Every structure is written in C-alpha cells, then in structure tokens.
Amino acid sequence: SRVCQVTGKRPVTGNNRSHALNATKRRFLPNLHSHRFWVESEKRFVTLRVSAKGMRVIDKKGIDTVLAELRARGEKY
Amino acid sequence: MQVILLDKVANLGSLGDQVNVKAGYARNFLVPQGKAVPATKKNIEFFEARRAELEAKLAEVLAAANARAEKINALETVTIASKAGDEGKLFGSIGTRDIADAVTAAGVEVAKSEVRLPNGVLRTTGEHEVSFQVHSEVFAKVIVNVVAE
RNA sequence: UAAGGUGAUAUGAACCGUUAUAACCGGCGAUUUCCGAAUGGGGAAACCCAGUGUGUUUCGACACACUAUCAUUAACUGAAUCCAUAGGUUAAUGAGGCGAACCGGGGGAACUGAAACAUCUAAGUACCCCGAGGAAAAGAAAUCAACCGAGAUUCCCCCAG
RNA sequence: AGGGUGACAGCCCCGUACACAAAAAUGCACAUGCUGUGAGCUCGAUGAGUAGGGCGGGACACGUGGUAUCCUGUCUGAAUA
RNA sequence: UUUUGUAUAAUGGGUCAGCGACUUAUAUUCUGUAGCAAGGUUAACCGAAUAGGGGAGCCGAAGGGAAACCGAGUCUUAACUGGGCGUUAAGUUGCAGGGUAUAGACCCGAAACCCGGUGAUCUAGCCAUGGGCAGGUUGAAGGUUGGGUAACACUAACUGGAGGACCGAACCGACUAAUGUUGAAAAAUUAGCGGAUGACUUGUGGCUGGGGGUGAAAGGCCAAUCAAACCGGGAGAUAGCU
RNA sequence: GUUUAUUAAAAACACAGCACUGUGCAAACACGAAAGUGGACGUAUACGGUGUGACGCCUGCCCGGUGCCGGAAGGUUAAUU
RNA sequence: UGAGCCUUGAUGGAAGUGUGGACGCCAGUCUGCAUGGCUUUAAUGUUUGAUGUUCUAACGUUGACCCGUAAUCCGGGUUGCGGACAGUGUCUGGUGGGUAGUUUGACUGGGGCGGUCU
RNA sequence: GCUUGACUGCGAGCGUGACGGCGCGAGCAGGUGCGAAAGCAGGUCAUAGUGAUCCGGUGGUUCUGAAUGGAAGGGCCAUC
Ligand SMILES: [Mg+2]
Ligand SMILES: [Mg+2]
Ligand SMILES: [Mg+2]
Ligand SMILES: [Mg+2]
Ligand SMILES: [Mg+2]
Ligand SMILES: [Mg+2]
Ligand SMILES: [Mg+2]
Ligand SMILES: [Mg+2]
Ligand SMILES: [Mg+2]
Ligand SMILES: [Mg+2]
Ligand SMILES: [Mg+2]
Ligand SMILES: [Mg+2]
Ligand SMILES: [Mg+2]
Ligand SMILES: [Mg+2]
Ligand SMILES: [Mg+2]
Ligand SMILES: [Mg+2]
Ligand SMILES: [Mg+2]
Ligand SMILES: [Mg+2]
Ligand SMILES: [Mg+2]
Ligand SMILES: [Mg+2]
Ligand SMILES: [Mg+2]
Numbered sequence: 001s002r003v004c005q006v007t008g009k010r011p012v013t014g015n016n017r018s019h020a021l022n023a024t025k026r027r028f029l030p031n032l033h034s035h036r037f038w039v040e041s042e043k044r045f046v047t048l049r050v051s052a053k054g055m056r057v058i059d060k061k062g063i064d065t066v067l068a069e070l071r072a073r074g075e076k077y
Numbered sequence: 078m079q080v081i082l083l084d085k086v087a088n089l090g091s092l093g094d095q096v097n098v099k100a101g102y103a104r105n106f107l108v109p110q111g112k113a114v115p116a117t118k119k120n121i122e123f124f125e126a127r128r129a130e131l132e133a134k135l136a137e138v139l140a141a142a143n144a145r146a147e148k149i150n151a152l153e154t155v156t157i158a159s160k161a162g163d164e165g166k167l168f169g170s171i172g173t174r175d176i177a178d179a180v181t182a183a184g185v186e187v188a189k190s191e192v193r194l195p196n197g198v199l200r201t202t203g204e205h206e207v208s209f210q211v212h213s214e215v216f217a218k219v220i221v222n223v224v225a226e
Numbered sequence: 227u228a229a230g231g232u233g234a235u236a237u238g239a240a241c242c243g244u245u246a247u248a249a250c251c252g253g254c255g256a257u258u259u260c261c262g263a264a265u266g267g268g269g270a271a272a273c274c275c276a277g278u279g280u281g282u283u284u285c286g287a288c289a290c291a292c293u294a295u296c297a298u299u300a301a302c303u304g305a306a307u308c309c310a311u312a313g314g315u316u317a318a319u320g321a322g323g324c325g326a327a328c329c330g331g332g333g334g335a336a337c338u339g340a341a342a343c344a345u346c347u348a349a350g351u352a353c354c355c356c357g358a359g360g361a362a363a364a365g366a367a368a369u370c371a372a373c374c375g376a377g378a379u380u381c382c383c384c385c386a387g
Numbered sequence: 388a389g390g391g392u393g394a395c396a397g398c399c400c401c402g403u404a405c406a407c408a409a410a411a412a413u414g415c416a417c418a419u420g421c422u423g424u425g426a427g428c429u430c431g432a433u434g435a436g437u438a439g440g441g442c443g444g445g446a447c448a449c450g451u452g453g454u455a456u457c458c459u460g461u462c463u464g465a466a467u468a
Numbered sequence: 469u470u471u472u473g474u475a476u477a478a479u480g481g482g483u484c485a486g487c488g489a490c491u492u493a494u495a496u497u498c499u500g501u502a503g504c505a506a507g508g509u510u511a512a513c514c515g516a517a518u519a520g521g522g523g524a525g526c527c528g529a530a531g532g533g534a535a536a537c538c539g540a541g542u543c544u545u546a547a548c549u550g551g552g553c554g555u556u557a558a559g560u561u562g563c564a565g566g567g568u569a570u571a572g573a574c575c576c577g578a579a580a581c582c583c584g585g586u587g588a589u590c591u592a593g594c595c596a597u598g599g600g601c602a603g604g605u606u607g608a609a610g611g612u613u614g615g616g617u618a619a620c621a622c623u624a625a626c627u628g629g630a631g632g633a634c635c636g637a638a639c640c641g642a643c644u645a646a647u648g649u650u651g652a653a654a655a656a657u658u659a660g661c662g663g664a665u666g667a668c669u670u671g672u673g674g675c676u677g678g679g680g681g682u683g684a685a686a687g688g689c690c691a692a693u694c695a696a697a698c699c700g701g702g703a704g705a706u707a708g709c710u
Numbered sequence: 711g712u713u714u715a716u717u718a719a720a721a722a723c724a725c726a727g728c729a730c731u732g733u734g735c736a737a738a739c740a741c742g743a744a745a746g747u748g749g750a751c752g753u754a755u756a757c758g759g760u761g762u763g764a765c766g767c768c769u770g771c772c773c774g775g776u777g778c779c780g781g782a783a784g785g786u787u788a789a790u791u
Numbered sequence: 792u793g794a795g796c797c798u799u800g801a802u803g804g805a806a807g808u809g810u811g812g813a814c815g816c817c818a819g820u821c822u823g824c825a826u827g828g829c830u831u832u833a834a835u836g837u838u839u840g841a842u843g844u845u846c847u848a849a850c851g852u853u854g855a856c857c858c859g860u861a862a863u864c865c866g867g868g869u870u871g872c873g874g875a876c877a878g879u880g881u882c883u884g885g886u887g888g889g890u891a892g893u894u895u896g897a898c899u900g901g902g903g904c905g906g907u908c909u
Numbered sequence: 910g911c912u913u914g915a916c917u918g919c920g921a922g923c924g925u926g927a928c929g930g931c932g933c934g935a936g937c938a939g940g941u942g943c944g945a946a947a948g949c950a951g952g953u954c955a956u957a958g959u960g961a962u963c964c965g966g967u968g969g970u971u972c973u974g975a976a977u978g979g980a981a982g983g984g985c986c987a988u989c
Contacts, residue, residue, distance in 0.1 A: 011460080012459070017444070025334085043311095053436075
C-alpha cells in the first residue's frame with residue numbers, strides 16, 4: 001500500500017497552494033521502487049518495497065540490522 | 078561510500094583497500110557479488126590489524142631463523158681440503174654445496190643459497206672470502222681453505 | 227420469606243399449599259432448538275447438503291459431537307537446486323462480532339460570513355474510517371524566566387478581547 | 388417524607404426516624420500464598436540517516452512576513468559534553 | 469394587509485375550539501434603584517454552602533505624547549510663547565428595564581450547495597439462457613435440358629428457393645379525429661393507422677449509480693421524480709423579499 | 711429503421727457508402743488513486759475518433775488568422791548550481 | 792570536448808646544411824627532429840561537467856521453461872530480450888472549459904440599445 | 910533690473926461640509942528677497958487641472974527594539 005516498508009513512510013496529505021494562495025488537497029507519497037537486496041548471510045534474495053533514503057538506511061545500519069527489525073515486528077520478507 | 082575492497086576491481090584492488098565509490102556500484106556489484114565489504118568498525122576496528130599483522134609484526138619479530146647470520150660465527154676454522162695435486166692444486170671443486178654444507182660437523186645444517194661468490198670460485202687453497210649471506214637481508218663471513226690429504 | 231398460590235388481557239377448569247423450600251424475592255448453577263461474527267460446505271437469515279468419529283442398538287438407524295479463516299508457537303513433513311527455504315499437516319493458545327456518549331488517530335466538505343468574490347471564513351466543524359479505556363490523551367524540561375528565580379502533565383479562574 | 392384508603396387522617400393500612408440482618412456472588416481497598424517481574428551497591432554507559440540544511444506543504448493566535456519554534460513528502464546531513 | 473390612495477373588481481380568511489411569533493446565555497453602555505464611597509468589588513476555589521473565608525484580579529480617583537518620557541500638566545516647536553488634549557466631573561458593585569455585540573436572535577418560507585447511503589421489481593443500453601410470428605403474394609442466386617459458341621458471352625423453358633421484399637391476424641407500435649378532462653383511466657376508450665423473418669418481438673436472471681450510468685441524440689431514460697434521482701445528515705443554509 | 715414513456719414521428723437521429731485522422735500491439739483509446747479490464751484471445755483488408763449520409767455528375771479559389779504536422783539554426787525562458 | 796588543478800614545455804659533447812610548427816609591425820626571427828669532430832597554447836597526468844558509444848549488475852519483460860501446483864492469478868528459480876533507458880517519487884516550464892468555484896456595475900420616463908458616472 | 914516668500918514652525922478668528930475633508934486668514938518666531946523708505950511677498954486675477962485607506966520603497970531620527978549589547982522590524986518626520 002505504497003509504504004517504505006523499512007521506515008513505514010506512507011503518503012501524507014497536504015495542499016497544492018497555487019499562486020493567489022489557492023488551496024487544493026494534493027497529498028505527497030514516498031519514492032519506493034522495491035529492491036532486490038542480497039541478505040548474503042541468509043544466503044537469499046529478499047525483495048523489499050523500500051524507497052529512496054529508506055534505502056540509505058539499509059546501508060547505514062545493515063540489510064540484516066534492518067531485517068533484524070521488520071521480522072521483529074512480524075512483517076513479510 | 079567507502080567500504081574495503083576484496084579483490085582486483087579495475088581502478089581499485091588491494092585485497093583490503095578503502096576507496097570511496099558510489100553506493101550504486103556497491104550493494105549491486107562490489108558487494109552482493111563478492112568483491113568488497115562496507116567499512117564498518119568491525120570490518121576495520123576488528124580487522125585493521127590483520128593488515129598490520131606482518132609488515133609491523135611478522136617482519137621484526139619473525140626470528141624463526143632470520144638470526145642465522147648472527148648464529149653462524151663461532152667456528153673452528155672452516156676449511157675444506159679439495160685435495161692438492163700436480164705441483165699443488167685441487168683435486169675437487171669447492172664451489173657452493175661445499176661452502177654451505179661446511180656445517181655438517183655437529184650434525185648441524187644451515188642453508189645453502191646463501192653463497193657469496195660474485196664469480197665462479199677458482200682453484201687455490203687459501204681462505205675463501207665466501208660471505209654466506211643467508212636471508213637477502215643480513216650478510217655473513219664464512220671461511221674456506223683448500224688442502225690435500 | 228410466608229398463608230395463601232398456578233405472569234397479563236382471563237374468567238373458568240383441573241389442581242398446589244397454611245410448621246419447614248406451595249407461591250413469591252435474591253445468589254450460584256442445569257438445560258438453553260434454529261438464524262445470526264456464525265465458524266463443516268452451501269444459501270434467497272431462521273433452510274439444503276457432507277466428511278470423520280461415536281454409544282443403545284431391531285445392533286443398518288438413530289441422532290449427537292469435531293471439522294471456518296487468520297496470527298503466534300511447537301512437532302512432523304517438505305519444490306524448483308546438496309543444502310535450505312517456500313509450501314503442507316497437526317496441536318495449543320488468541321483474535322473475529324455488538325454496543326450511548328466521552329477519548330486518541332487516518333481522511334475531510336459546503337451552505338454561510340466577507341452585505342458580490344478567489345486570499346480569508348464556516349472549520350479541522352459535519353461526515354466516513356481505525357483503535358482503545360473506564361476514562362482517554364498527556365507527563366517528569368534539550369520547559370520557562372531574566373541575571374531574581376520557577377520547576378512534569380492535566381482541569382478551573384484571571385491575564386485579555 | 389410520602390402513598391393508599393367510599394370527601395382533606397401523625398395515632399386504619401403501607402411506610403417513616405431509628406436500629407438490625409447475608410448461604411453465596413461480586414466493585415474497590417488493604418493484607419497475604421503462587422507464578423512472573425526483580426530490589427539494592429561499585430564502576431560504567433547516555434538514544435545518527437538523527438540535529439541542522441535546500442525544495443514543497445502542514446502545525447504554531449501568527450495568512451512568509453524581518454518570522455523564531457514544531458512536524459515531514461523529497462534531496463541531503465554534524466558535533467558527539 | 470399594503471399603499472400617495474382601497475367599498476374597492478388588490479392581498480388574506482368557509483366557521484369554531486386548541487396551538488401559533490421579540491426568547492435565552494454572555495459581554496458592553498445607558499436609565500431607574502439599593503449598598504458602600506476615594507474607594508467599590510471579588511473570580512475560581514475552601515466551605516462549619518445562599519454564610520463565612522478567598523481581593524488573583526477588575527473599575528475609579530491623572531492626564532499629555534507615536535514613544536522614551538514628563539506629570540496638573542503635557543505635547544507641538546529651536547521657542548522657556550501661542551495652539552491641541554487635560555487639570556478642584558465620584559466612583560464602583562449588584563437588582564430591574566432600554567439599546568448594542570456574539571449567537572438561529574421576532575416566527576414561518578426558497579431555488580439551491582456539500583457529506584454519507586438506498587435504488588436498473590419503471591426505463592435506457594448490453595450479457596446469458598428460453599419462447600413467438602394465422603393465413604395469402606412475389607419469385608433473386610444457383611442447377612438441369614434444348615438452342616447457341618471454337619470455347620466462353622448469351623438465350624429460353626423448367627427447377628429452385630433469396631429478401632432490414634409485398635398484403636394481412638396474433639404480437640409490437642402510435643399518424644388522425646371524436647369522447648373523456650371533479651375521467652372507467654395521474655395518457656385511456658372508440659373508429660381508422662404503421663411494422664409484422666427482422667436494426668423484430670417476448671419471459672426469466674444478470675451488469676452499468678448520480679456530475680455518475682445508459683442514450684439510432686430528445687437532455688431523452690435512470691421506480692407517476694431528472695439542465696444532475698431518492699433517503700438521512702451539515703440544517704433552524706442564506707432570504708437587503710413577501 | 712430510431713426519437714421527445716405523458717402536446718413534436720419530422721425535413722431530426724441512424725443507416726450502407728465516402729473521406730480525413732490516430733493507432734506497430736504491453737496499440738491508439740476508454741473504466742480505474744492502483745491492481746487490473748475492455749479494445750481483442752483482434753493486430754493496419756485491424757481498431758478508435760471525427761465529419762459527410764444510397765446512387766449519378768461532381769466537389770472550384772484562399773494557409774493571411776486559429777488548430778494540427780514537420781523543422782528547430784538563432785532569440786527568450788523553470789527548477790537546479 | 793569544455794573547464795579546472797598544476798608537473799614539462801617558449802619571448803615578459805660543438806659549430807656548420809634540411810624538414811615541421813608560430814605568427815610574421817616580415818624582408819626579421821622563435822622553437823622543435825641527423826650528420827658533422829603568474830601571465831596566452833598545449834602534452835601526459837587527475838578531477839569534474841557536455842554529448843555520444845559499449846557493458847551488466849540495479850530496473851522492465853503482457854518471450855520460453857521449471858517448482859509451489861494434475862491454477863489463466865501470484866511468488867521463487869533458470870534462460871532469452873531490453874537496460875541504467877523505460878518508469879515512479881519530489882521539484883519545475885508548457886498545455887489544460889476535461890473539471891470546478893465565481894465574476895460579468897448603476898442611472899434609465901419599463902428594460903435594452905444609445906448616452907452617462909469625477 | 911534684481912531676485913527665490915512656490916520659505917520652515919504656528920495661528921486670533923471665520924467660511925463650507927453628515928462625515929472624511931476643503932477654503933479664507935491678520936498676527937507671532939526663525940531665517941530670505943526687493944525697495945531710499947513706508948511697505949510687499951507663505952506661488953500664479955480668482956474659481957477646474959484630481960484618488961481616501963491599506964501594502965510597501967527611499968532619506969532622516971540615537972523614539973522603540975521580546976534575556977543584555979547591537980541588529981531586523983516597528984513608530985515619528987519628509988517623500989514615491
Ligand atoms: Mg458460512
Ligand atoms: Mg453453517
Ligand atoms: Mg458572501
Ligand atoms: Mg399602486
Ligand atoms: Mg376584496
Ligand atoms: Mg382561534
Ligand atoms: Mg417486410
Ligand atoms: Mg404488413
Ligand atoms: Mg427482466
Ligand atoms: Mg420517470
Ligand atoms: Mg451549519
Ligand atoms: Mg429555513
Ligand atoms: Mg418508416
Ligand atoms: Mg411525446
Ligand atoms: Mg405524437
Ligand atoms: Mg447530415
Ligand atoms: Mg471544398
Ligand atoms: Mg464552468
Ligand atoms: Mg459559494
Ligand atoms: Mg439597472
Ligand atoms: Mg487663472
């Protein structure tokens with residue numbers, strides 16, 4: 001449902017606010033692209049519906065430190 | 078993105094180098110493929126001495142035998158009787174094997190490729206300026222004296 | 227608790243009690259058809275059909291009981307590929323649905339007012355959706371003050387239209 | 388207090404003040420057994436894709452205004468007493 | 469009632485009985501009135517509850533200047549003048565009333581706008597599966613045989629049986645007239661009329677839902693409703709009008 | 711043949727035919743926040759859109775304006791830095 | 792190929808003849824390749840943009856096959872094709888009656904037209 | 910001819926407006942000019958030649974400036 005899956009980023013709702021200050025609900029949504037990550041240690045290819053930046057996380061922490069959680073909260077993958 | 082290397086890799090290969098390459102080239106090839114691992118403490122603050130575990134240690138502590146040059150000195154007149162003949166000469170050939178094997182006395186046994194013969198040893202009888210240079214590092218000074226029966 | 231009782235329109239009829247469970251009142255239970263989350267499957271709600279068991283058996287019938295899905299865990303099984311997973315079966319747990327308001331969260335109008343109308347207003351209201359408790363939410367300063375100091379949050383009165 | 392009773396009753400009736408009563412079942416307090424939690428003391432440790440920042444929005448009484456502060460869809464991204 | 473003006477042939481009322489429209493909360497200012505007086509008065513809250521306590525605070529006795537600031541003065545100005553606003557006006561708190569503000573704000577009334585649902589048992593398209601079309605007529609293509617040709621063309625009889633083909637019941641439809649118009653009927657009856665093997669007609673069930681559907685297109689149909697359905701809500705929308 | 715069920719059956723809609731134009735298929739296009747679906751289990755002799763409306767003889771001149779198609783060298787120009 | 796950064800380059804073992812390059816204030820020279828006794832423009836390096844090629848390894852696949860599975864879905868696997876393109880998110884220029892909210896004055900010998908408005 | 914009174918601060922008192930506002934104004938203070946002087950000049954013989962507020966721009970000012978010193982901003986005066 002368009003969710004970062006790793007950071008839980010969802011599509012927020014805002015206003016278009018065109019010139020003359022005209023309000024018009026628009027709503028923003030995450031990047032997401034679903035990657036083909038290689039757990040390596042788990043010796044498998046786990047594809048997750050990640051998202052820009054949310055991917056930078058997989059790098060900063062770990063494709064395992066990430067999956068450390070996720071499965072922690074009982075998620076897919 | 079830094080990460081340590083683990084193989085050839087064109088513009089970067091030190092089987093343990095740290096180069097800042099795009100995170101795309103990584104987590105897509107250099108990594109998940111077997112070619113490099115992120116530079117994360119453990120991969121360093123726990124694997125950084127493995128590198129300095131030689132040039133720094135296995136280079137000056139390695140006394141396994143490098144002290145050979147120093148060990149060989151206390152001798153009792155290292156001489157080899159190549160046997161004289163015909164107005165005084167040599168029946169044998171004191172080249173290399175003999176100079177290095179000049180330790181088979183007390184059953185001891187030293188190297189051999191540690192010869193110091195800038196040229197093909199000649200035939201005489203006097204002392205040989207043979208400097209049994211063990212390791213390509215430390216030198217030495219062994220003597221050889223041809224005689225007869 | 228008691229001399230009267232078998233709810234009402236409802237008399238009557240057959241009866242039950244006057245000393246101790248006659249009636250009736252309160253606690254705890256028993257039974258509690260079928261529909262309905264409805265859960266064995268199906269379905270035009272209250273109906274149609276099945277599998278596996280089971281006892282008395284005229285030993286067939288009878289009927290009754292278990293069998294939904296998902297989640298966690300445990301055991302056993304187990305593909306593409308040694309492995310290993312995926313998948314499969316079982317069991318034990320728990321959820322499911324309903325409900326007045328109050329409460330937290332997701333989403334969010336317009337009429338209207340501006341004596342017209344776009345910014346602005348109505349209003350984060352109405353409304354939809356999710357979740358929770360007896361309350362919720364909030365909460366022990368990376369708060370505020372002003373060189374003096376105060377010391378979490380919450381609610382009321384002021385400050386001040 | 389109040390209600391009923393053949394018209395308006397303190398003393399007809401039911402109640403009323405007051406004083407009493409629980410096999411059991413339970414709300415809430417305490418107090419305790421069980422399971423689980425785990426107290427205290429010495430020395431340590433001190434919340435990074437985070438704080439900030441650019442773009443777009445939103446919340447702040449505060450309509451970007453000279454506009455601090457809070458939140459984040461997007462791109463970034465530190466010090467570390 | 470409305471009007472310059474109504475017996476007015478201008479509005480409203482058949483009649484009666486009951487109901488039916490300037491309210492309420494808070495705030496602000498006046499008037500009356502009571503308390504106290506350069507003072508008046510408490511708010512929440514405590515409570516031995518209409519007490520008593522609580523004076524946080526609000527209003528008033530000082531004003532002028534944009535302000536710093538000064539002060540019965542103060543601004544203006546270089547001006548110590550003049551000029552403006554002030555200075556020997558009693559205020560304050562209740563209680564009742566007049567007015568105003570925020571509220572539905574005297575009462576009743578739109579056409580409408582927005583939000584969530586209910587409707588394809590009528591109708592419009594389509595989907596699946598079944599049914600129907602008395603009778604009478606015309607007679608295409610193709611074929612056989614004779615003629616004909618070098619062979620084909622071509623020809624004529626017969627055979628054959630086509631068609632949004634012809635006449636006409638059922639069935640479908642709806643051009644005309646009359647009657648009906650408080651109808652027999654919220655569109656029909658009667659006499660005529662058009663199609664009638666087809667883009668035909670009909671039964672059962674299904675699918676499209678409202679700014680949306682469907683439409684051989686009239687804005688037509690979407691349950692006697694349609695230039696945006698019905699139901700409930702925002703809602704006592706708004707009504708400088710009656 | 712179709713049409714304003716309930717004042718309009720028509721010269722109106724439709725029609726076979728004609729023309730232009732878009733679409734190389736995961737088609738154009740349409741329903742849908744998306745998944746997906748229709749187009750079509752079709753594939754340019756196909757499908758969509760538009761206008762004209764059997765058939766006969768025909769369908770002239772204008773590309774200035776607007777639209778569409780091609781060019782895109784040069785002028786102007788967003789965020790971004 | 793821009794632009795940088797800066798290392799090696801010109802004006803601010805020995806003569807004597809050739810053959811390029813730089814323009815020549817031109818007739819002068821500068822500077823390169825045998826035999827003979829800091830400021831201009833580069834070259835490699837290195838960075839970083841602009842194109843444009845090739846690659847695979849993200850990503851696409853509504854090609855083929857295998858397993859879940861005696862499923863057209865979906866997921867995993869293999870292979871082929873494509874490939875950093877496409878596509879999506881955020882930002883941004885164009886287009887945009889497809890849709891939405893509205894505006895579009897009053898006077899007036901009825902209104903409108905005409906005229907008027909200080 | 911010579912000049913800058915088309916000056917600065919104020920203003921008794923009036924006129925005219927529902928109001929916002931508009932107009933006339935002797936005289937006072939400071940500095941000007943013209944004249945020998947009295948004196949005249951605060952734009953044109955007069956009456957049309959015009960746009961309130963807000964939001965801002967510019968110059969000036971020690972008015973204010975959110976802990977304090979500055980500063981941004983605000984006020985005041987001139988002006989677009
Ligand atoms: Mg069921
Ligand atoms: Mg059942
Ligand atoms: Mg309005
Ligand atoms: Mg009249
Ligand atoms: Mg009358
Ligand atoms: Mg009456
Ligand atoms: Mg016919
Ligand atoms: Mg007929
Ligand atoms: Mg039907
Ligand atoms: Mg209708
Ligand atoms: Mg309302
Ligand atoms: Mg109303
Ligand atoms: Mg006809
Ligand atoms: Mg009609
Ligand atoms: Mg008709
Ligand atoms: Mg036509
Ligand atoms: Mg023509
Ligand atoms: Mg419009
Ligand atoms: Mg409106
Ligand atoms: Mg008018
Ligand atoms: Mg004049």
